[PDB]
Amino acid sequence: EEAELELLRQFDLAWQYGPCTGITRLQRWCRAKQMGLEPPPEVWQVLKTHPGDPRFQCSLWHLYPL
């Protein structure tokens, strides 16, 4: 923790995985894996050792009335 919260914030702004501020984080991870762009096997291995926490399993701007 506090290092796992920057890896996800770095996965969320890389443009080669998609334009993602409307959906979940694991849905975008599996969308890129289907098309197989290059999802890395570390943004998966922190979404498995946690429960349904809203500060891991949510996009950066999931507040913010946009």
Partner: protein, 431 residues
Amino acid sequence: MFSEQAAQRAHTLLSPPSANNATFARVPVATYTNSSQPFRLGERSFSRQYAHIYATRLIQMRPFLENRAQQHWGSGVGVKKLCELQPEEKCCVVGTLFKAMPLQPSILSKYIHPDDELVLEDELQRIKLKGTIDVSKLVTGTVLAVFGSVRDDGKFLVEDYCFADLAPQKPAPPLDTDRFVLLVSGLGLGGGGGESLLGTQLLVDVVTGQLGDEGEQCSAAHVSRVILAGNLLSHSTQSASVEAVKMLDEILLQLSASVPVDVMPGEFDPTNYTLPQQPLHPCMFPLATAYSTLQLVTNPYQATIDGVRFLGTSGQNVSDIFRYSSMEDHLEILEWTLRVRHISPTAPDTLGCYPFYKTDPFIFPECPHVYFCGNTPSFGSKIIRGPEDQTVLLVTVPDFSATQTACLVNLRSLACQPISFSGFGAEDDDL
């Protein structure tokens, strides 16, 4: 085809009564498969934004255009991203169009104007385009490859450009005895004349087996299916619609007695507005839901009718392209839609759709044997060829309220013949 065989016998009906009159049987429909499952929407969550659709469209359409620009311009390839371009160097770019037209209405008849620009756009930035390219034949939303160089004013000079093209097509088995399929569109129940009433009556009387001699009754017994394609209730003004569903229920009862029927929603029909239109709710048809020969489908309809695979719409993509382009011929617009590998490229920018996010479903994944359209103002049909062994029959279905014309498609020779109905009017040839 049909009217050739309809005279192949003897004529009995200008005669006094007899002991027996012949009867027949409807031909079996021993193979059918609906494969329109990507258009049936079970979850239907809104609250996304329209940027997930363009991104997956580009990501899926990119290798087709790379693989065609290789064999269309030589394997000494120069394909490059839009940011890595050096001034005055020959390269190929794969991107998405955006047509910048004024006179397109904002929130607060054709719409093409003598000045309007094209812009090639990728995920990161844009660039303007001039040179040898058509300014008014192309529409916003087409994905294409292009050849040229970055000039000094930041613009781009285009020499030639290529589209995605036709998809592969497996061959169909040949048939033994010819089966026919009837296509109708746009009855317009609610307003549109009284000659349309006798035309609708004569049409259902011919197909059900009430009219004509043993020739017509032998030939209408071979018609295997009936497809009704959109715009069933033409409406004069919304703000009438309650009394029309009663008559549509009666007509679908009189057709569900003999044939199998498939019913599709249209531009005015009680469904949603976005483009994968969902089937009609059965609570508006009390009488016709007694029989299991009536079926209710959606907008984009696929099927596999006796080996031959069909795909069609109710004519909402073709008229949308007709609004914001310069082409007039509806058969040509249908073939152009086939050429860019997308059923409706102007969506979403001037034709609304659902906000998908996993995969764009309007990209052709295979090639259909028949490909029809909806409520077009006149009949037309054609055969086109692919680069590989790919042949496609293209039909435009007329509108019944004005022309009173339907289409018969043979399933063994793969040809289309018009059928027209006309009772006599207030006609007196002595004035």
